[PDB]
Every structure is written in C-alpha cells, then in structure tokens.
Design a protein around this ligand. Structure first.
Ligand SMILES: [Mg+2]
Ligand SMILES: [Mg+2]
Ligand SMILES: [Mg+2]
Lengths: 405, 171, 206, 234, 137, 208, 16, 30
RNA sequence: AUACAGUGAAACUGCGAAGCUCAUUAAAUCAGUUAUCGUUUAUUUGAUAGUUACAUGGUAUAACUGUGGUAAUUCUAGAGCUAAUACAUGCAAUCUCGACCCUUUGGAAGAGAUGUAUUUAUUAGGAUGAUUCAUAAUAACUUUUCGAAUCGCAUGGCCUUGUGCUGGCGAUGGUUCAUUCAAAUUUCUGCCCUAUCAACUUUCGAUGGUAGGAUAGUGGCCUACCAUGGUUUCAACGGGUAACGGAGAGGGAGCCUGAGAAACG
C-alpha cells in the first residue's frame, strides 16, 4: 500500500530541525516551498509534543507541548489553532471528558491533576504519589489514576471526592484502560502481569502472567487496550512485543514484535475504517499497521524522529502522531479509508505529497544479541540484512534460535 | 502562574496571612525544563536584563571530566542510573544536576591507550579496579555537575574513590 | 469572473471580463501555483500557459496559498503579533470575483494589451556593483561614467538627476580605515609604554 | 521619579525654598544625587552669573565652563566635592568644599591649584591581564597605581593627564575632612581608628580647638598632614 | 557522615585517588573574623555543613547578637531567647519581655539548653533563620 | 564544474577516469564551494556505496553541521558509522573532505576549532587510513629528488611557496602527533622523509 | 550604635 | 505526612463537585 | 557640482512611551536603621579589545509605477522596481631571557612567548575582619559571543608626481569592570482597647536537614526523602476601632515587548 506524509519533518534525523528552517528561509526562493500545502496552520509545538487526542465530536483536536508547557486546541473547520494555554508543569496524560474540547482532565508530571474548562483552569488537585496513566469511567463517573504506588487511586467527579483506592498486588501501574461495553479494567504492572478489576464491585477478577518463550529478559506491561467488541484485549511489553488476548482464554492468540526492541507506547484498534481485523502498534521508532488474525503487516509509518503518541481520526485513513520534532506528523493512507470530511480535497493532491515508502515486516537484532543467540555463523548470509549497528532477521527464525539458545 | 513570593506562606507564629498585593514580574518563576536524553533541543529564554538562559529540553552529549588524569572529553550520555532527590527522574531518564548517568567510555579509553601505550610506566598507568571494570563494560558512571535547565549543557565528571564506592552501594 | 492576466517579461498586465461560464468551469478545482492551457480558456488564448497566482472573492477576501479549501476560514495571520482574519482558500471556485494569472509561455497569437506593449523599469541600479552587473563593467572601468541619468524639465528649465552611488570606493573611506588602524596601533603602543613604566617603577621598588 | 520639589531638594545646595515649584534634578554622573551640586545651581544661585536656566544653558553651549578640565554642556551635570570648575572668560577657578554648616562653598583657587585635585581611594583591585587599578570617590579608574596605595588613602590627580602625582596614607595625625554626618565640613586631625569588623568602623578626630568628635570611616577624606594641607582651604 | 541520599562533600575540594599522598581527606576551612577563633573540631572534624560559618559557604556580616539557648530539639538549629525591659509610660514602669530567635548551629559547636551563645548575621538560610552560632560559652 | 555534474553519464565521457582523478583533487581543495561542486560531479558517477552515504558526505561539506556529522557519522562503533565492507570505497572520499577542511586557514576562533575537530577524528580511523591521510599531506611536497640524489637541495625548489607548503605539512604532523601520541603510524615515505627534507630545506634557505 | 546622620534642623537657626 | 497531599484526604472538594454527571443507562451489556 | 552634494513629503532604521475610580487595612502598612561576600541595572562618568578588502550578496523589500477585489476600515491580492548604522557574509606584528660584553645610554646571535565570551573539571591564590573574592594557567565545551564592509566637517605633512604614502576635530557603534540613577529581598526598633479572645500552627509546608527545579539572585519559593518540631499567660491566636487616621480600567484565564511592566499597550 501507500503512505502519504501530509505534514511533518521531511528532513532526515541527523539534520537538525531548527537549522533547516533558517536554511529554508535562504531556500525560500524554491517553488516547492511556495506551493507547499499545510493542512492545519500552527500544527507544530515549539520543540516537541507529548500527547494528541481527537475530540469525540470529530471537529476538534487537543495536544500538549514541551516548553513552555502548553495545551493547543485545533479547530478543524477553521483549519487552525483555536487557542494555546500554558501550564505550570508538563503533561503526562490527559482525557477529554466532553464530546467537544470544553471539559478535560490533565495529569501533570508534578503529581497534580488539573481540570480545564472553557474559560481556563477550573481546579487543581494532587494525588498521593506520582501518576503514569489516567482513565475515566462514564457510567460510574469515576476517574482512575495509576501511580508509582500499588494503590490505584479513585476520584469521583459526581461527588467531588476521593474514594477507596483499589489495592494492586504489585507496585506500580504503567497503564490503565477501561472497556466500554463491559466495564472491565486493566492495570499494567511493572512485573510481567496484568491485573483485571471490576468497577461494579471492587474486586480483582484475575491476573494474566505474560509468557515470552522467545525472550527471557524481564519486561514491563507498558500499554493495554480493549477492543470495541469487548472480548479481545491487547498488551504491550517493554521488551517490544504486543500480545492480543481473547479474554475468555488464558493464552496469547498472537505475539507480534516490532523488532527494534523498544517499548510499546500505544495500541489502537482500527475497527471503524473497515476490515476491522487491523491493529496499530507504536514504538518510539516505528508505528505499524498489521492484520489482527494472521500477523501480516498492512502498512508502516516510519517518521525520522521519535514517536511519543499516535492517534487515529475515527472512520478515516488519517493519523496524527506526537513527535519529538517541532512539527506534528500526520499520515494519510488512502487505502485504509477516505480522508476526513474537514480536509475533503486532500484526495485531489495525493500526487504532490511525499508518498513515503521492510522495517515493519522483518525483525532487528542488536550486535550483542547476535553473539548470545549463536547467530554469528549466519553473519554474511542472505537470511539476515545489515541495518546500521545491528542486523535484521526473519521473525519466525529468530524465535527458533532464541528457543535453541 | 509560578511565583516565588513568601507572602502566601504562613507567618512564623502560625498566623494565616492575607494577600497583600497582586503577583509582580520581579518575583516570577518559569516551568521546569525536564531535560531528557535525545537529539539536542535547546530553547533560549530572555531573562531579567538583556541576559539569556538556555533551556536544554533534550541533550545527548556532554563534556565529562576525568579528574585524576586531568582530561575532559565530549561523550554521549547513555542513561540516568541514580538521582539523589527523586527516583521518578531516574525512571523517566531526566537529566539534572547531581544525577548519576552512564557515559560512553570510547574517547577516554582511546586517550588512555594513546597516552600510556597500554590497553585498558606501569605504575603511572595503574588506575582503580572499579574504573577498569567499568572500562571493560564499556560505560562509565559520571555525575552531572552542570545545570542543564540554566546553561543548556550537561557537563559532568567521572565518579572516583569514595564517591564511586558510596554510589555503587546506593545502586 | 474577471481574469487579471500579467505578462511579466513585458511588465504588462490587463483584465479580461469573461461572461460565459465555460472558461470559468475549466478553471475550477485548480490551485494557486498550478498551470492551465489557454486554448481551453479561448482561441485568442490558444498556445498560452497561465499560472494561477491568487485572486479575490465577491466579498473582497483574498486567496491564501497553503490553505486547502474552496471556502473562507478565519486564520491566525501576521501582517510577532498575530490576528485572526477571514481569508479564502486556495481552491479556485465559482465564488471568485477576480482571478490573477501570470503568462508563463506565449502562444501563437499576440494579445493586444499584453504581448504588444512594454512598460519600462521605474528605477535603475544604485549600488556600484549592481551598476557593474547591469553594464557588465570590468574592474578597471569606472561606474561613475555609466550611472543612469534621468532628464527632468520644469518649464523652460531642464536638468539631469542621477542617484548617489552607494558602496563606492572613495578617498574618504580609505582615510577612515587608515585612521582606525592608526588609532588601534597607537593605543597598543601607549598601553605597552605604560606597562613598561610600571615595570620600571616596580624594579626600583624592589 | 524624575521631578524634584524644592522643599524636598537637598539642604547643602542653600537654595531658597520659595523660588517656586520644582528644583533641578541632578543627572547621573561622578557624584551621587544627594552629594552633588548641579551646574545650574552653581552658575545661577551661587555665582549669580546667570539669571535663569536658559541663560545657564546659553553659557554652557558657549563651552565656557569646564569641570575638572573637561567641557560640560549638561545643565544638571552633578558637580561635587573637590571638583574644579573653570571659567576661562573670567579666568576664574573654583573648588567645591563643604562649610562648617554643611553646604558647598565656592572657593576660588590659583591656576596651579586648579591643575590638580584630590581623590579618596574607594577601591583597589587587579583588573584583566593582571593590571592593578584604583577606584576613587569620583568614579575615576586609575590603572598602574603606586603599590603603597591602599583603600581610604588620598591620591593627588593631575587633571590634564588623569594620573596620580602623589598620595597620602590614612594614619593617625593626618589632616582629615568630614564628608558626612552632622560633622560634615569639619576639619581635624586623626586621633584613633576604632575598628569593628563586620560593622562600621569609627574614627576619632580632634580639631585645632582640641574638641574631639567621632565619625564613621566612610565620611573621612584625608587632605594632608597637620598644618600642611595639600589644598588651599577657605 | 554519609547519612543522606546524596554524597556529602565540600564543593570544589578534590581528592585525587591516583596520587593518594595523604590518608586524611583534604579539608577546606576559613576563619570568620571578628576575632572569633575557628574551633579545631571544625579543622580536624569529619562533618560536612554547607551552612557552617567556618567550613560552609556562608559569611558572617551585620549585627552580632547574644542569647540563651531555649530549645535544641531540631537538626543543626536552635532557638535562643533574648530578654529586655519594655517601658510603659502610662504607669511609668518597665516590664520583662523576650523574643525567640532561631539560629543555625554548626556541629562544631556543642550547645545545651541554657548556655550563652553569641551569633552573627548571615544570608537567609531558611524561612526563618538569619543568624549563625559563632561562639558558645 | 556545475556543468560536469549535470552530465547524464559522466562515467561514459571521453576520459572519465582521468576526470575522476582530477575531481578527487578538487574534493580536497580548501574552498568548500569547490568541494561541493567536485563532490557533486563525483556523485554523478554511479556507485551504490557512495549513494548510501551521500547525505553524510554532503553534511560534512556543510559548515553548520560539520561538527555534528563527525561525532555521529565517523565515531568508532557509532550507529551511523560506515560498515566495515564500505570503508574502502567511502574513506578516500572522507579523507579528501577532511583534508580540504584542514587546509582552511585558522583565522578565527571558529576556524581554529574546525581544524582541531578534523585532527580529532583520526584516532577513530584504522591505521591504514591514517597513513593515507598523512600521505595526502605529503604529496604536494616534492622530496623524491632529494633522497634520490646525495641529499642536495634544488635552487628552483627554493621559493617562498615551497616553505609555505612545508609549514602546512609540518603543522598537520604536529597536530596528528598530539592526538594519536604513541599510536601514531610512522612510515619513511609518508611522514619521515618529507619531514626530513623540510628540515634540510630550512637550513639551505637560512644559510643561502 | 550612633547613626551619624546629618540633621538639617540642628544646623538651622530656631531664633524666630 | 498529610502535608503536600501525600496522605489521601476524603473530604469533599467543592470546585469539582458535580463536575460530571453519571450516565443512567449504564453499560451496554446487561 | 556628470556619482550625490541646499531643502525635503512618503517610506525603511534608532530612541522614548514606566490624573481619576473602588476597597480598606494595627508595627504583615509605614517610618528610622542594617546587609547584599545574596542580586539585575538603559543612561551619565572613568577606564577597557594589535591575534574582494581601492570594501561581498539579495540569500530584498518598502515608499513608488501599474492592474484589480470589496458596502467597507489604521481592509486587500497579482505584476514591476530600487537603498542602509536594516538583513546576511567577510580580511608582511609585538614582548621577554638575552651571548657577542662588540660599543661600556647603546646596539645585538639565538632560544622562547603571545585574544575575549559561555559551561564543566583541575592547579595557583593582590584585596577585605572574613571567602571557593580579584587574577592567572591547563583540558575540553558551545545553535562558540565580541574583536568597525558606518557617517559629517577640514585637506595638513611628505616625498619615492603617482591623486603614491602618511593624516586633524567630531558622530554613531562594541566586550568587560567600576561609578551613577534605580529595583528586589533583608537585620533591629517603633503609644489603642482587649482573656466576657488561651491555645495557634502541621487546613493539601507548619518548624528544620540533605539534594534538585526555578529566580536576577538568598530562601519550603516549589518538589523528593528524612526528624517532629515552631509561637504562647513576659499575652500567641481572635475581636473592635476618628488605623484616610492596597487594588482595577467591561468580568475572570493565557501570552507578547523592554534596562526597567505580570504594562491604563
Ligand atoms: Mg456584495
Ligand atoms: Mg561609557
Ligand atoms: Mg537549595
């Protein structure tokens, strides 16, 4: 398939972003810069972007920045920045409670939860210990905040009161997710275990101990996600594998690795687009779309700069990603689905776009891991492809050798 | 929003003070610069007077000093290992002063071989067993002595002697 | 809609009102910077190539490059201070009162008002090196003889006006540079003399 | 603030309080605002050479007035203690010295006396490239001083070159001039320097009438040896 | 000495492990002046104190006071009490008043509740501390 | 040279190899603009290994990124480092590019730092490649006649130009010795005899 | 402690 | 310990009281 | 005035823009006084930088010419110009030790030596009562700073007659230090009635220690860990007051410039 980069850094990694613009000012004579198309004006954070989320209304977007730490809200109808609001500390996570941008809850890195309303900062509260994730239950009207401590703190917006926190067996919860159809909860502990809780009662239904035959090194559950249907569950391990679980069974339906060995930050189910059996798994380096049932890579999005988050506009082929660079990359896959309503004529200009292009399909090994895996004899053969410090490998063959070693 | 005024605080006797005036610009504070290892990104901040401060939001290299041999080399920073104030900074790989980090040993190793003609006269080349072990590993423990959020640098020095033993116990 | 067509080689420009909707339709759905074939726009335009450069709508708001819409939006534009102003998108559509076009290439026939007419440049070079580039002067040749002069006649009085050459090498600049060098040298001499006198005083004290 | 009320103007100027609403505000310069006499006051309200501010401005733009050998054209230039004011049209040379009341007195002097002044060494430090220098009370930074010169000493500055011709150490039995406190303007001889580290030092001074008084160290200005001042006194 | 998460050291004092000339860790100290004898327990001690007037980066300048220690229940600081007589004109009589001053104490000084301490002013050490113990008796 | 780059098939010109040799010489020229033109014509020749590292070579010619590219592209064991197989093809291009940078006079603090940076990357190179860099410095100096004969200096070679070239060569060797120190690779042809002829050159000039 | 601050009122005559 | 919020306080916080209202329908599943 | 040369709209640069009305507050306001070795500081004043060039580019446009849109604005797009103290780039020396003691002021072989700014590490350490102070050096670092591509008036002294060399008084700029004008914190003291106001503070820091973040800087100013402290019957805390005897520019929130503002912009 074909991936089009509508906006972002078209320059490679070693080239620094800031120099390019000054040299771009010198290169302003170039016709292409004049003819460049920008979907959203001021769609770039000052130095980097932490998180990006699209309002459920579909007509607004929100994002968080690095310096000065700030919140940008973009109006798709006007294709520009509605406003930017500075904050006292950087944002770890946030959620948009209302269908629009009006009400949102932001979890800062200074241990404080900040409630943002249309006019400004409505209220700020502090939790007992540092938080790493946040989620909101509509039915129960409670906001759940993971933290370094074992407790999973619980705040009720209806009563405006903190309540009894759920006591996790393990210390720490990297990510928390709630299942809309079911109400289940998941918590990603530092140890290789995911604990499921009930919001109706306050009880631990069960735990999954993630099992990795391929890799014996310790790992953490970085991210968790629930599919719309409600019987399927996705996990992300710090070592860099993604597990899809049918909740009724206790074994992984499929284990696909990104291959670079980096943490898995975000997992999205592309149920809206069509051919629901597609999932997105994102590292810092690469975010790849692959088929749920069979594990065949549909497409891949390799930005030059690292990825802090990826967000999918529902029902469309467009993706937004929060990156370390000044611009926020947005990728359009015409095959996956039609362009959003607001940018209707983006389809007409598909030729002009970059049309960016192996990394997703194949696995990558570090040089040290090659020596441990007894793959040195293979070195110098077709089975492996040299990429930079390490050498690529076929996914299945890696599993066999690691089982051997 | 950040202020450094003492008026909001309680008095010594415990009395609750009322607001005496609005916040002024000569008593301000700015958001912390959460430096992290990565491609160099620095932000210039216009301060009181014409002076300027450099906000190292991201930095992957630093000028680290081997004090015993009296040399300084520019090396890549691998990651933060230990921070006395908060372990959350260690978890997120945040660079600040006094943070114990791991740095590449390649330039220091090359300099030592070049100067003393020995892989890492013999009495002078002798160094601490712990430092040699780290050199064998490939990464050296160093302490950041610069303030990245102010000067925009991540300079530091290699741990040695009592400092190294103490932190090794702490690790 | 009116077509404001400009031939920049001549420096000429003229407007053509187009009453029939058909030319306007073949213009539709394009973007600023794209090119269109004149023959579709008409036989008199046969062989011409027009680049779309901008335009204004029935409410007077301009088109902006980079904004990809056929309708107006309020964008945050700068004339550091930024204000929100209504501006039209870059997609040509039926709502355009006037469309600006540039003639990239000439066709078979000559347009009466553009290809057949010329408009001289208003001003000429003023820096010495620009004069040299215009006339290709050698270094030995003096720009002073080649300065462009304009005749002005007020009543029966008449005289020539010429610009003041900028970045021209004159004795005054050489004198200033020599003075600066001499001043620096003299300052160094004096400071070394003072240091030597202080050293002699210390030697006497010791 | 940029406007000064005449009743709020400093005492030592001797200005009449009922002249009107505003007094001159001394501009920034060698001497502090509260220890300076702006040229407008000196030329108009002391010498009576000018009848109003405009006439003083005319005189200054004529470049007849020199302060320490340099022509000054700012009306509110803050002339101060031990400053030499020269009017060549009259061939008049003046030196500013407080009186016993505590007010500047216009003391006429010879040309030779006008050629030099006295400066109290307020600071001594090594500058860049290891060049020693002294900062005097009037803001003059003089490089390559005599090594024996220290803080609180006095240096006789040649106005033409701005170089130290001679110096006087601060020691008991030296002739001193008070430049602050209630004893401002009094002249005496040092008797004892009481020292409080971390606090203001004290100096006891005895006048020719054998009356003794105590003044802080900062307010002392060594002007010569007893019976042999380096400057003509009024 | 190393009872904290961070390593306590005198800043910019370097001990070269390679040279290993002397067993004793190099110690930097200064005399605060005012004829206040710098105690030897600071010179040959092992403590590290950034706010000690003799080994820390704090300078004694300004008012010098005297007082009686009233509390020593906190770490490296004490509360002294200064007493005086306040004059009431309506009854033409004096009455006893007192003020409590929190003062930082360097570990080089050993103070009990009741002894007489002379203290010197320094920069704000904390919210309420502006004085430093410089002599005990 | 801009015309040379624009040729569709520079490899197929009447004299491509001889043109290629001269292009290499220009790549080492002090004027960075010549290097960009000379490099561009070299890239016109189709070579897969060079095409892989084309951006890195261009970054090296760029002044603003010269420092960053060295630490990333050339550092031993670095992720961007050239593969061992491709060292042979790319390094000759790298050596000339660094040679041209070294020839740039040290007239400002920035230029002094750039000269230091060029010499500081040598320890990353393998010994055969460092020897090549020293050889490139000594090609200009003509010394084969001196040691071929019984060590007599030619008067025609005695010119102010020659001494200037020798001062440039000796400064590079001094800078190299300071960095590599005991690791410095010493050869008779590449370093020692150009060095010796330089001393013999100074004595003849000073006396004559 | 002595202020050593010049007081204008002391030097002014109060004869009136 | 209670200072800086390090202990959990269950008193009602007025500004966020009635910030959001629960959905009466409940979860999609019975 | 054959480059212009007097005056000069417009335009581009530079500098400065820093009375009223409401509330009320007991030594938290204010007054006197102390410190900044704990800080920022336009301007004034005094010192202070030997480390293609007979002068580079548009990587540049305005005013202006001309074509138009709109009901319309200190609303507008297209085409064509042209400048800088605007924007970018950028370049044949001096001092020591000094043999020969040749001449005895003196010349002089050779050996040497040679910016500034930021950050870190390390070494040495004239000034103050006191310093890790001033200063110097070593090794590196840097979105490596600065180190006259400027202007007015005058046309002197030389000669090697080339418009060759060397030049007088000013203006505008620029690094650092000190001074001055300011600002911010800060030590001690300072007339009401009160117990029918005896506990107050940890009430999302209260008192203190270690480290970090921020600030122009000290400092719970803020954050992580740790100890349980701090004020008070010698009146804490609370209450009343002839305590006129601090706030805002339609209402809250966020941001921008400057030496100086959370700006009556
Ligand atoms: Mg209309
Ligand atoms: Mg000045
Ligand atoms: Mg601190």
């Amino acid at each position: 398939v074909s991936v089009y980069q509508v906006s972002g850094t078209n320059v490679s990694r070693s080239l620094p972003d800031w120099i390019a613009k000054k040299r771009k000012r010198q290169l302003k004579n170039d016709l292409e810069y004049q003819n460049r198309v920008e979907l959203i004006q001021d769609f770039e954070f000052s130095e980097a972007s932490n998180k990006i989320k699209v309002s459920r209304d579909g007509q607004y977007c929100m994002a968080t920045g690095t310096y000065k730490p700030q919140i940008h809200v973009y109006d798709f109808a006007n294709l520009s920045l509605k406003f930017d609001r500075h904050t006292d500390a950087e944002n770890v996570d946030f959620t948009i409670l209302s269908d629009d941008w009006t009400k949102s809850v932001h979890l800062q890195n200074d241990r404080s939860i900040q409630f943002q309303n249309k006019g400004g900062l409505h209220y700020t509260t502090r939790i007992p210990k540092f938080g790493r994730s946040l989620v909101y239950n509509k039915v129960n009207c409670d906001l759940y905040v993971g933290a370094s401590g074992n407790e999973l703190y619980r705040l009720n917006l209806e009563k405006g009161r903190f309540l009894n926190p759920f006591k996790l067996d393990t210390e720490g919860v990297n990510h928390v997710s709630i299942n809309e159809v079911n109400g289940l909860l998941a918590a990603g502990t530092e140890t290789n275990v995911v604990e499921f809780w009930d919001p109706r009662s306050r009880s631990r239904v069960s735990k999954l101990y993630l099992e990795n035959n391929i890799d014996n090194r310790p790992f953490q559950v970085t991210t968790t996600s629930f599919r719309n249907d409600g019987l399927t569950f996705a996990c992300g391990t710090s070592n860099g594998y993604s597990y899809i679980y049918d909740l009724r069974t206790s074994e992984p339906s499929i284990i696909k690795d990104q291959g670079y060995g980096f943490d898995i930050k975000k997992i999205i189910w592309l149920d809206n687009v069509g051919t629901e059996n597609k999932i997105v798994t994102c590292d810092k380096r690469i975010a790849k779309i692959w088929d749920r049932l069979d594990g065949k890579a549909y497409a891949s999005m390799e930005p030059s700069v690292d990825i802090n988050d990826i967000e999918h506009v529902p029902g469309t082929g467009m993706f937004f990603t929060a990156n370390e660079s000044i611009p926020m990359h947005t990728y359009y896959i015409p095959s996956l689905g039609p362009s959003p309503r607001w940018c209707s004529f983006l389809d007409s200009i598909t030729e002009e776009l970059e049309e960016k292009p192996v990394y997703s399909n194949y696995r990558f090994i570090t040089r040290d891991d090659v020596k441990k895996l007894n793959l040195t004899h293979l070195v110098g053969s077709r089975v492996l492809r040299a990429y930079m410090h390490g050498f690529f490998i076929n996914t299945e063959l890696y599993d066999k050798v690691s089982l051997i070693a | 929003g950040i202020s450094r005024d003492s008026r909001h605080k309680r008095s010594a006797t415990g009395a609750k003070r009322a607001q005496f005036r609005k916040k002024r610009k000569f008593e301000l504070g700015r958001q912390p610069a959460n430096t992290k290892i990565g491609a160099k990104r620095i932000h210039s901040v216009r301060t009181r007077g014409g002076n300027k401060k450099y906000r190292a939001l991201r930095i992957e290299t630093g000028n680290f000093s081997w004090a015993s041999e009296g040399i300084s080399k520019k090396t890549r920073i691998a990651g933060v290992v230990y921070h006395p104030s908060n372990n959350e900074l260690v978890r997120t790989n945040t660079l600040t002063k006094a943070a114990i980090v791991q740095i590449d040993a390649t330039p220091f190793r090359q300099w030592f071989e070049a100067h003393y003609g020995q892989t890492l006269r013999a009495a002078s080349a002798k160094i601490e067993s712990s430092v040699e072990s780290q050199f064998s590993a490939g990464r050296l423990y160093a302490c950041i002595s610069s303030r990245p959020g102010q000067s925009g640098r991540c300079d530091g020095y290699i741990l040695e002697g009592e400092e190294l033993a103490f932190y090794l116990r702490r690790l | 809609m009116k077509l404001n067509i400009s031939y920049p080689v001549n420096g000429s420009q003229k407007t053509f009102e187009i009453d029939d909707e058909h030319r306007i339709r073949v213009f539709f759905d394009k973007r600023i910077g794209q090119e269109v074939d004149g023959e579709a726009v008409g036989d008199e335009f046969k062989g011409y190539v027009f680049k779309i450069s901008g335009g204004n709508d029935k409410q007077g708001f301009p088109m902006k490059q980079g904004v990809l819409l056929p309708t107006r939006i309020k964008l945050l534009l700068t004339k550091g201070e930024r204000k929100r102003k209504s501006v039209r998108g870059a997609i040509v559509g039926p709502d355009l009162a006037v469309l600006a076009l540039v003639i990239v290439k000439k066709g078979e026939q000559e347009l009466e008002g553009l290809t057949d007419t010329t408009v001289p440049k208003r001003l000429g070079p003023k820096r010495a090196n620009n004069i040299r580039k215009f006339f290709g002067l050698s270094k030995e040749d003096d720009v002073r003889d080649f300065v462009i002069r304009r005749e002005v006649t007020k009543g029966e009085k008449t005289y020539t006006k010429a610009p003041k050459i900028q970045r021209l090498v004159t004795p005054q600049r050489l004198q200033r540079k020599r003075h600066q060098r001499a001043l620096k040298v003299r300052n160094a001499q004096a400071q070394r003399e003072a240091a030597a006198e202080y050293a002699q005083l210390l030697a006497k004290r010791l | 603030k940029k406007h000064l009320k005449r009743l709020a103007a400093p005492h030592h100027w001797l200005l009449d309080k009922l002249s009107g609403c505003y007094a001159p505000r001394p501009s920034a310069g060698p001497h502090k605002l509260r220890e300076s006499l702006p040229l407008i006051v000196f030329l108009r309200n002391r010498l009576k050479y000018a009848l109003n501010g405009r006439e003083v401005k005319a005189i200054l733009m004529q470049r007849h007035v020199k302060v320490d050998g340099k022509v000054r054209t700012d009306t509110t230039y803050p002339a101060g203690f031990m400053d030499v004011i020269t009017l060549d049209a009259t061939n008049e040379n003046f030196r500013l010295v407080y009186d016993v009341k505590g007010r500047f007195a216009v003391h006429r002097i010879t040309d030779e006396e006008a050629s030099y002044k006295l400066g109290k060494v307020k600071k001594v430090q090594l500058g860049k490239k290891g060049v020693p220098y002294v900062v005097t009370h009037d803001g003059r930074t003089i490089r390559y001083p005599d090594p024996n010169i220290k803080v609180n000493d006095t240096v006789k500055i040649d106005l033409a070159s701005g170089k130290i011709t001679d110096f006087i150490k601060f020691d008991a039995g030296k002739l001193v001039y008070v430049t602050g406190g209630r004893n401002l303007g009094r002249i005496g001889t040092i008797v004892h320097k009481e020292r409080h580290d971390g606090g203001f030092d004290l100096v006891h001074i005895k006048d020719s009438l054998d009356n003794t008084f105590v003044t802080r160290l900062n307010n002392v200005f060594v002007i010569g040896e007893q019976g042999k001042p380096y400057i003509s006194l009024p | 000495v190393q009872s904290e998460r961070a390593f306590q050291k005198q800043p910019h004092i370097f001990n070269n492990p390679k040279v290993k000339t002397s067993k004793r860790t190099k110690r930097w100290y200064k005399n605060a002046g005012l004829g206040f004898k710098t105690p030897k327990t600071a010179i040959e001690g092992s403590y590290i104190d950034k706010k000690c007037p003799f080994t820390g980066l704090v300078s004694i300048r300004g008012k010098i006071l005297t007082g009686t220690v009233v509390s020593t229940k906190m770490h490296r600081t004490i509360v002294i009490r200064r007493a005086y007589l306040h004059y009431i004109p309506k009854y033409n009589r004096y009455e006893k008043r007192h003020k409590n001053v929190p003062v930082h104490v360097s570990p080089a000084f050993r103070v009990q509740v009741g002894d007489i301490v002379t203290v010197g002013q320094c920069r704000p050490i904390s919210k309420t501390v502006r004085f430093n113990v410089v002599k005990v008796s | 040279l801009k015309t040379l780059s624009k040729f569709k098939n520079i490899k197929n010109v009447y004299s491509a190899t001889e043109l290629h040799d001269h292009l290499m010489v220009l790549l080492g020229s002090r004027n960075t603009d010549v290097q960009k033109l000379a490099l561009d014509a070299l890239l016109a020749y189709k070579n897969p290994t060079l095409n892989k590292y084309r951006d890195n070579l261009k970054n090296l010619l760029d002044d603003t990124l010269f420092k960053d590219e060295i630490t990333t592209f050339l550092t031993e064991n670095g992720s961007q480092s050239i593969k061992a197989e491709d060292e042979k093809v790319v390094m000759p291009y790298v050596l000339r590019i660094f040679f041209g940078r070294a020839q740039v006079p040290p007239t400002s603090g920035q230029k002094r730092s750039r000269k230091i940076a060029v010499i500081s990357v040598l320890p990353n190179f393998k010994k055969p490649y460092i020897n090549d860099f020293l050889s490139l410095a000594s090609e200009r100096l003509d010394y084969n006649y001196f040691f071929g004969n019984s060590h007599q200096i030619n008067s025609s070679k005695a010119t102010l130009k020659t001494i200037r070239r020798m001062t440039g060569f000796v400064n590079i060797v001094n800078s190299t010795l300071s960095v590599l120190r005991t690791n410095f690779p010493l050869h008779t042809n590449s370093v020692l005899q150009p060095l010796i002829y330089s001393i013999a050159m100074a004595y003849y000039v000073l006396d004559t | 402690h002595f202020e050593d601050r010049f007081d204008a009122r002391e030097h002014k005559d109060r004869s009136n | 310990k209670a200072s800086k919020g390090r202990k959990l306080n269950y008193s009602v916080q007025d500004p966020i009281a009635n910030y959001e209202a629960p959905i009466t329908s409940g979860y999609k599943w019975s």
